[PDB]
């Protein structure tokens, strides 16, 4: 039953190419619902889910205003951070930002996050209490000293505890058909002959929501972790996800192997065998 809302911000500096890039995206569980792109002609917070289009002019005016505000802050951080590690005005650099909250099956508050990175290495993040900070290096000890005084955490804390959960809860009951669903994987198994003696068995999980899933192979009941080719879970493009796992097996021995499938929408985890 448990849920969550996350926002992602990315800024790649464009030196000798003008205004920095800025992409803002927003999510409920694994369904994206809003975005802002700097180079897009709109200059407005746009709907990416059909259940968010239901909101009025005051909501879009509200999210537009606040989003331009996030953008301009990032425009400044890039130079501040450039002014610490001794970076040239020449090269490009990236700032990343995640914040959001999580809830349970009762929809009541679980936890909040605010993370920050510079150039793919972690930089500064709210500790799990929402009252303190983790500084990844010496440079973000200055950022920490700075934010600690100006009670930045306490603002971030009140949103993440209250306003965040309340908006998440309106969204879940507006996208009841979309967000409050769990689609069991459609599972099946293929057999390809590598040689006259070896054969590939691929175990498939298709059309599931949300993205979380475990696929494993066993032989006679002993896990084949070392011998399993596993792919990263992947979007289908229609709101659902896909995944597979494969083992290379000797011909005749196909009955020794079983595929095991765990999902949020399967009442009993499945055990698949080749005929």
């Amino acid at each position: 039953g448990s849920h969550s809302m996350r926002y992602f911000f990315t800024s790649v500096s464009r030196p000798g190419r003008g205004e920095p890039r800025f992409i803002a995206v927003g999510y409920v569980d694994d369904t994206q619902f809003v975005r802002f792109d700097s180079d897009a002609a709109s200059q407005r917070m746009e709907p990416r889910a059909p259940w968010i289009e239901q909101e009025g002019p005051e909501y879009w005016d509200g999210e537009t205003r606040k989003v331009k505000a996030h953008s301009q802050t990032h425009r400044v951080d890039l130079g501040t951070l450039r002014g610490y590690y001794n970076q040239s005005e020449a090269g490009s650099h990236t700032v990343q930002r995640m914040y959001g909250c999580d809830v349970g099956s009762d929809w009541r508050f679980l936890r909040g996050y605010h993370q920050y990175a510079y150039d793919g290495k972690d930089y500064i993040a709210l500790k799990e209490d929402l009252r303190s900070w983790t500084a990844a290096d010496m440079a973000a000890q200055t950022t920490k000293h700075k934010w600690e005084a100006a009670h930045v955490a306490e603002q971030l804390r009140a949103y993440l505890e209250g306003t965040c959960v309340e908006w998440l809860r309106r969204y879940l009951e507006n996208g009841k058909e979309t967000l409050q669903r769990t689609d069991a994987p459609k599972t099946h198994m293929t057999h390809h002959a590598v040689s006259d003696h070896e054969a590939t068995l691929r175990c498939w999980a298709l059309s599931f929501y949300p993205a979380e899933i475990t696929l494993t192979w066993q032989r006679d009941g002993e896990d084949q972790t070392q011998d399993t080719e596993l792919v990263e879970t992947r979007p289908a493009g229609d709101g659902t996800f896909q995944k597979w796992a494969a083992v290379v097996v000797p011909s005749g021995q196909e009955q020794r192997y079983t595929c095991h499938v765990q999902h949020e929408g399967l009442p009993k985890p499945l055990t698949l065998r080749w005929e």
């Binding site: 926002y7 927003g26 909501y59 509200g62 999210e63 606040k66 989003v67 505000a69 996030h70 802050t73 400044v76 951080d77 501040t80 951070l81 914040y99 920050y116 950022t143 934010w147 100006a150 930045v152 603002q155 971030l156 949103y159 306003t163 965040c164 908006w167």
Partner: peptide, 9 residues
């Protein structure tokens, strides 16, 4: 719904 007054780094 985004957070409002966001602090600079």
């Amino acid at each position: 719904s985004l957070f409002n007054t966001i602090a600079v780094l």
